[model samples]
Target chain A: FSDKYYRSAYMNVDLNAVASNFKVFSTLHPNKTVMAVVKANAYGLGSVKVARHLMENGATFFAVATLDEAIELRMHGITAKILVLGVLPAKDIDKAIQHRVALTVPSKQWLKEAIKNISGEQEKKLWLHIKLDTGMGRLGIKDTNTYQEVIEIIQQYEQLVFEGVFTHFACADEPGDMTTEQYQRFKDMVNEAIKPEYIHCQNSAGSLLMDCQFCNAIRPGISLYGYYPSEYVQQKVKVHLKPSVQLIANVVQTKTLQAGESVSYGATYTATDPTTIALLPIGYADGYLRIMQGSFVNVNGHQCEVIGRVCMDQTIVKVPDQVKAGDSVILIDNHRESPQSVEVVAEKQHTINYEVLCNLSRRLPRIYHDGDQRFVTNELLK
Target chain B: SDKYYRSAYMNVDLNAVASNFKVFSTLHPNKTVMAVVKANAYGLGSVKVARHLMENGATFFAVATLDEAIELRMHGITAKILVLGVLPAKDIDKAIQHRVALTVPSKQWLKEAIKNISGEQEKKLWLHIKLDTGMGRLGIKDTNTYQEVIEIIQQYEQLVFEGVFTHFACADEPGDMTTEQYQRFKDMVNEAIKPEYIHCQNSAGSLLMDCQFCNAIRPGISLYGYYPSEYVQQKVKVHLKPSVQLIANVVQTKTLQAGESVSYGATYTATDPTTIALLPIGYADGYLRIMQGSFVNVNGHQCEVIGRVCMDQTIVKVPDQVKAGDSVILIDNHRESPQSVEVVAEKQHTINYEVLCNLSRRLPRIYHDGDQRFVTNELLK
Candidate 1:
């Protein structure tokens, strides 16, 4: 599958793989429901469609970060319940209520404010979730004193419905004993407090390895897009989560330079031998950061090193003789001739897989692959 | 401002200018608004912003490149266009044919342009004389070249002298250099057989110091709602409104143990089991990597940036109660508050004006005036 108008790269998403991953996850935890976190444009894969795919595969609920994201899904006609996993300003309480989005009550003050602002709502209930700070200290009801107030406030507001109690696992992706300790702390907090309609603690890593008893709902963020939660889970998860994105660019101009001819700004690279330099229509402005200069891109199925400093609109890649203008260069994909992984790019840049995947600038068009059909996708402007 | 998606975006206030301009316009009722729309209105959506200024009674427009002038024309902007930058000697015919004004520096290029249009029937195309007072990048460096270019232009019957101008190399700094540059420009222009319009005042010159304005004023960054010089932080007499703001969504909210690291390169470690909110914005989106560990406002509260800025995600340390889906305002109209460009400049070690101008067009632009929704500028539509 391919698309026109998408310059430099084509993100190839495998719907079957997503459905299969969801099915496998469900099979692993039969009693628990899987709530996919499709925020950040579905981890930079286009959220609306990803959410639809998850919904098609029996995902009853969805999670996003802001009211705007929830509204985007709603505008796309997705009616599945969406829980905003972040803070909602008191001023925007009316907006959140009007959108019929759930709120994550991180503090007692927020619970009090939400209850005060949304007291008269009678048509629909504001789905409220209490987040406990188990180990990860960001945005949760950290103290037990506040927890009591949060519980009392939720009980008082008929418009506010206690949907769940959740906590985020910090070390779940890494192979460490800390993951168990975090899970234990979360379990102890839930055991001491009153249980809500649902409890979720497991993210991508926890869903892959930990027991289903960790929570009633598993929020699988990275894994839903077919990425292993961590290096540790890569060994345990035998089935590969098909990488959904492939950044490709065409060689714009090709020239041969003698040994010692430098390339780009500050004379970063001086050719040691006769080199065939291919200028690609991709650069730091295209989200291929300057730090990725030494990184390799697949040229006609052969890996080529990116030479020189990445400019705003172009990058120079050192390739073998056969490479030419219009020849495809794969930055990430499973194409037979030029296979590369997000992990590979991340490692080369001294970063992580998350950075590599999301770094793709919004300028590039997102080409969504659903089964055999290729759909041209874009964010709603303005 | 809230009309757009809750991702990284810029908020532009046009009414603030309508108000600011109302005041400034009253002060200078006679001088026409030569709204500078260069560098895509200094990265504030040029055509639309220029149109807004034009509708508010601006008669003239200025841009840095012929491409920018052409872009305005393509958008049906019929106002008088001035190309402020040097046009290659080869492109003189195109400039004259397109009825666009050109800035001439070297005598060689001026003579060539004059020779090409020697027999043309139409009135000689408008040309602005550019004197190299101090700016080292371009223009006629030698005084002889400047004198000869003016002499040749005076001889050409097909040429109309639009103006004689010079740029300030360092008008922003508090020094005698600007006064020196002004004197040099005056000396060069005094030698010319008086051009029709003798103008030489950019935003900095207009605001900070008194300068002779022959006919027109080229206000660039200040016209787009920013201060020109740090030394002159006092609000300009001209009514300018900031027309851009950036906001992002909290994608993931998680607690970090005291030893746990957040984001790539592990540059930020949890200080005391703190909470972190991951925002869906990074260096790729024009929020440069230099903004790592910078502070952004979330729901009116200041949030400290925590980890190395990822390509598309940035980690911000919020209160333990901050959660996913929270709104982070990178810039707004709060007085005495940190503007996006200011934060990038002060913390990221860059210029505020350039940072504001360099904001990538990839992020959605939601135009608003007060609570009214104006429009969005996304190409996907």
Candidate 2:
């Protein structure tokens, strides 16, 4: 549905850069097999295509949170081994087992129920990963007693095969001494105690900093997508990884407001001088959260600050005289000519590039750009 | 294939409604359920959710706007639908033609609605009299105004008062405000007009104060798996199952050295060498920008967010082991770490209802009924 108001934004994705980044990561961790995490629609980039690109670039295993996600990969004819990272409920175990998706058994209750549910599986045993909570008191088997119980349940259950034991680092990305403490605790848990076939503790941040090769599998989430976990690490690793997503909107209507005339709801931003305001067809209802009231956008290769409270379906930006309706407005992209980079937009909203990209409400259509060519267009779910 | 980021799309569980309805139906045995499908069914694909609710014995449905109600009607949903929000008197004919029940608030709109449908074949239009009690948004302020509207309804033969309802402005808050509103509504009902159905309870009132469910109950967020208020003791007692789960994929993985900044504005600077994975989903995908510098679960692993959240993408700081295509589960039933709607509301500085309801319609929703895979609901389709 193309309206005069709706100009599809182009998401220029560099596949060659993605393949090169994968090669660089493999070179860094020569001994570990990479388990690429492709959940949340490959982070909202459209999972099927991203997964295919990663698989082509030497990614062997896949990780997703839901059965439907794994099913989506399989439906797309992806033959790679997919692991269901989050534990599936007892009822959903049959689908997981039938689809050859690995399940994370976080508790004995889940293990028992999964064992009871699965039936007539193939010769290849059902793979299960155990999550051990070290410091983040959120999930996993926390106490040593509970950990031992889980290990025993894994060993006893004939239907389930223990694939790996892993722990998540809570403060590994933060600048503090707690990261080392958490790393030491994870090491102690896996060092002398029961060990599975594959042990994975290092997420994107842990794998980059820690010097432990005992674990064979590395699960990189954010780093694989051209972002560093913390600012400190960003200075050290200077690899060429192109950002895959760009959010763009078209100017629906452009008008100059007289001094003291307000724009949008509550008349939040009043014109100081004769200010040029460009109304874009995107708003808080489109996931450009209300917090981005005073953010900026790239108009005609120039930076323009977003004015007033962002309405449900439109956002007003203060631009220069040259910016007109139908002009391309770059919300977040890799173009150097534009002032609204992911970093710049994040700052204006008091947030990071991740939130800005994720909050690019589902309203905007995603047009894929491969190299110099526009390959595909997927409209936002209306 | 295009080289975009990998993000997991949500598959909503529809049959969970059947289960949730069974549970709520048992609680309020005699009272009929007026399924609230406002804010696009709490962003779980509105039309499909409404259909599921209707199939599961929801006799009535309520929406916040006329457009929402009309959209449902256009989809051929013939269930008795009510527009709960204030509608301009000018649209009374459209409401009547569509067979949608309107919420009559002011004498002006009522008089206009009566005048518009005076000589029509289907002259009688169903409406609910809205009382201000205390909400202060829509409804008549004075109790005498309710008396006058009732007298007008008695005089007019073309309008039928199907129900009388009042909203609790702060039913979710801890105070005597809800009780006060209920008392005012009851006094109004006792003094002048007795409609067919009298409902003063929303999700909070239905759960906390069951005595207020005199006839019917209208539930919004709680029906979509969230607690309405904090004052209630048995907050988690209800079997309201969560229908939406957000997942994303790791697109690119990079290493950051000490003193290096990540994402826009360089909000999060690295102190140590940290591995950061960029996610495909961002604020535009309903993973709001307020979640910046917060933590999201990746493969049931706690991943710290390092930088500013971008429009269509966000970055999570994982260990170096995380790869380019790893899956990130933002919200789910198993990894119930981030308290669903409530925590998001607290972070976004809004109510839980608004947070859940404000989920944009752009995110693709794949509906599920237990193990059965249902159709995907996308407006683009």
Candidate 3:
């Protein structure tokens, strides 16, 4: 009943839904360019496929967390303008330049060292994006002095091209002055320096919640996966995003649990009454997490409680009597109203929706559903 | 200066894994060492870990799912592998064809599997009877059902009852539950035909207590140099070297003003002028967001994580002496170290098992066997 993977746990990613989500951004921000953030394997939903799908859906630019992610996209036939959002080591600068990947200049010294490290005879100009710290002090030029110095160096070096200038918002998803302050800081930093071609600081939340006249582009990361950054963003933003990902694992076995029988590693859960338990081929190792021991899953449309400690690779759930082996168990559904929606899972896990999607381990195969066609990719099986 | 895509990496000491395995084998002399390498050897690269263990007296392996079993066989793991978890009857043919054993969780599963397998199959289908003694996850719980399942297996000429085992519930802590479970396991396996391998003692069970009745012992967490519980670590008279350590290069270090905030939501802000070093490792790399206030070892100084753990990076307050290209030890092998797996797990409110398993394939595993070093990047591969 299973395909070549032989494992019941798998994720179904609708490419159509991803494309539609991109359209939502394009409709909302008509004049701005949307850079699809496909970092962490598109937040653990197969980066190559998701990136490719987004490119076809009018996404001209792609952003990732590391140089490896940018390289991965390049190797996978993604010829779009790719930017490494995180700090890239000076040693890897040449490699990024060779890959035609834009490097984020976090500081003036980093840019100085990066330019010095590059070969003078290099044919292509090294594309760079100036990262302003603004209020988020993680990385970037925090002051106007350093920002002016960075602009001077950019102008001085012929090998380097100031492709973009941006800053990350710290509290864009929440209702606060932090985002407002961040926006003002970003504008101040940008206005003091020679403006680059791309002056963007809006993330998914900023794209949905706030309108900025300065930014020419918007980066939609979580929203592209059909998840608003937070409840605040969901409530404030008037947009509908089809949840692209659904996690489903077939029931390996179903059996009756006698009253007083304990389950799993620590025997944390005991059956008070006679109930049927179904074993699902998912666990903490599969990204279900040990913290989700008391969460519920969808079984034949009924919400079944996850009984006991979630193991490294197996989880037992108190299911309905009709739940049998080979029956599909939805750990996470695409429907927002579903009991096992990613939002509910995020709440139960005490984390944001981003982490939940990003934590889906590579052990589970990703099945991409695109209209009438279907494609499956497994990292382990390869 | 790191050759990895990112400066971050997981250094898996294969020699330490080997030592841990030998420690267990030495503890249970004459008992078979069944190495548990499921969840990609608990997310530490199963193929390499299994290959090393098989060289060091571990002839059998246990995985959680069928795909894991096949993954080993594909990577040239010739040793016996038993899928410890329940598998759908439809996958019996795949398991049998690959020479990997399957666990018969229930009578219904066995009956369905029997009907699926052909009587005249070229290869013998190995079925390990899983007994649900008290850990009510899987296996035939009832005595009558167990007896009937054994009888049904005997009738099938193609089926080889290779192994029968039960998992412990509370072996990590001092409890009667494990003892009760072991007793139930003894009652079931004793009554049935003794197979080639009869095991029930997991890493915690094998280390905390001795089971003379079992011919085999399965070590999961301990083999990777971690005691299942703090109770076991204190009780057991054995030393395990931590096989894994998370290391990352300080991408850049910057002096932040007192009012400057760091990372998402600006959860952490500098109280005074302090230096923060950015490390290219984050939640997506298994450094969970909950470890925001944790610490990493930078140049032997315990540097506090000063900001929210981002998806691909983290910022930690470091000493002024800390600089770019310096290695930051996010997880140290030494148990007493602030950044050790034990402390990291504690910071995340989880066990060492989840901590190890949570280290995603995004982090390339650099294996060190004595002086030999090689890398396995799952994504690039």
Candidate 4:
């Protein structure tokens, strides 16, 4: 469905901004490979379309959270080298190999289980990336014994192609020595083993902040969608990311509320003076979030304050007198300095910009903007 | 995709949902059970939920937008569907075509819709008059606008005044505001030409109070086995069975040293040596970052979630015997369970409604009824 058919809100995803953002990383590290992290449905910005666009603009590699995500990309005609970072069931070994997607070998037990399930007779090579737990104690080989055992299993299985070795940093987003510590550990482990095609631990933060001398590839996740991992990175790095998405909606209704009249559930917001309230067709279900009741939205260049608690499908905001029904409202704008920007919305919800972007649910039709044409993908409308 | 391939999923018991629906139906036998299935039936597949409710004796349904109403219509939901929120006049034609009801909020909106809706139209556009009693969200607030809206509906042969309704602001609370709002709703609705449906009760109202004036009531969260508030739960005798349970597979497990931390930001450091299991469920799946110190059920034991929850994974301190591929219950169907939706909601610092609604489309919903099971993945479709 197109935006014209949508009666409610829609997300305006500027692909030109996305392309520009992707180029920022490419330009920064001219020699290194930048694997686009399009996981979580490209942070809930429509993965298939986002990956397609990114691939069109020189993205040859991608990373996702699960095997399902990787398979989804493969089914959607994404022929790029895709990597599944999370642990998958040993049973899905055949499916991963069939799709030509790389699977993460998180631990020795996982590797052993996967080897036992694989048919040693198959001709297709199972691509694997050994995940070493440097400091992030989530999923991976924590010690040399576990890593060595995991490597030993891979050597025994002729079907397993050791494609990559990497580790994740826990404190890369912050100003700390943890990133260096993690990188040093990653380098030490990789230096002792047979180095594969991709050896890197640089996320969006590390890619922008520091350089990995031994690494040949970098995975840029949030930066590809035009966001720095943290304020420190934004201030310290010379790269500038264009805001890619703007949550655009139309005002469904405008009403004049008298003094002392309450609004929304529990009547949490009451007017002290006469006010013009415009109801936006976007709400928490659209990922505007209930906690963002007091945030601001942009209406006709006016910073309108959101009044009342955000409902499941609608939100009430105090707009200017000039605002009327059908007026365009920007709950989240592309301009970072705008009151309704993604950063401001994240701050209002007391979360990072990544959560705010990821929380933009499938309910909001994602409208793509590139050059003169516009396309939309609405999961519910389908 | 195989369910075991991914880590986390939600199990919805269709039998419990059926039982919960019957609880409301038995409680209000004469009144209409207008099943509220908005926000994708509170993030539980709306089409399947609505169809199940229809088979179980739900004649009416309420949605929040025109798209939802149209979606239901497209999915063969032939029941009387009403959009509770205001829609743009431009889309009224689509709503009329689908026989979906719309909320006529104001006189100006009514007049504007009349411009696009011609007199020669064969299908009548179903509309419910929205009266803003005290909760000034959207509705005809004053008497004059109310009368004008009624007159306009009467003037248009193509527009059908099917119902008159007002939402309660504090029906769940032990306060007089609901009473005040009811009085105002009564004042406006009593004087006007009574429509077929007059509903002022949401889930909380239907549970806590009985009304003779309103012929129908919309039960939303209760159908999924949840009370609106503590006041309503204490006041009501209804036994609503919770249907939804969230579970994730422990992808990997490792022993953390006394000073080793887990997850992003390295916020959690072990006081002593402890075993930690990683669950492939995180904020991106609607398990928000606020659930850092919350607990998940690991082999019937409460395991504390450690550090900051990442976008795609969370780490929980588990028993020493917990291994990779072990099942971890993040939210249980039993209300008393420590990892129930209510407990998860409390940990997230919000109500059950937001918590349920926030469960993203990433997690596949597995519906169970007796031995019949069905899996639905929005991303896969």
Best by the TM-score measure: 4
Assign candidate 4 its CAPRI class. Answer: medium
Please say which candidate is ahead in DockQ: 3 or 4. Answer: 3
Candidate 2 — which residues are off by over 4 angstroms?
Answer: A1-13, A119-124, A135-138, A142-152, A193-195, A335-339, A347-352, A377-382, B1-46, B49-347, B350-354, B357-381
Per-candidate DockQ vs. reference:
0.08, 0.07, 0.68, 0.64
True contacts kept of each: 0.06, 0.11, 0.76, 0.68
Per candidate, the number of residue pairs that clash is: 20, 118, 0, 0
Off by over 4 Å in 1: A1-9, A119-122, A236-239, A258-263, A266-274, A334-339, A379-382, B1-304, B307-381
Task: Give the range where candidate 1 chain A is weakest over 10 consecutive residues by summed lDDT.
Answer: A1-10
> TM-score of the candidate numbered 4?
0.97
Model 3 achieves a DockQ score of: 0.68
TM-score of chain B of each: 0.88, 0.91, 0.96, 0.96
DockQ score for candidate 2: 0.07
The sequence of per-residue lDDT tens digits that candidate 1 reaches over residues A1-382 is 2323413344566767677777777888889978878866676677778888888889888888666678888888789889887566555677777778888887775576666665454457778889886644334666676777778777886777778888876667676676677677777777776788889988788888887575788888778777775667888766556566778777645666667555664456777888788766555534566667787888887888887766544577888998865588887774322336777776765656665665665445677666677776532111
> Stretches of candidate 3 above 4 Å error?
A1-3, A120-122, A136-138, B1-3, B118-121
DockQ of 4: 0.64
Over the full model, what C-alpha lDDT does candidate 3 score relative to the true structure? 0.85
lDDT value, residue A26 of candidate 3:
92
Give one digit per residue, the lDDT tens place, for model 3 in A78-182: 999999998887877788888899989998778878877787555587898888888663468888988888888888978788899998887888887878878
For model 4, residues A261-313, the per-residue Cα lDDT tens digits are: 88988888888999889988888888888898787888888888888988888
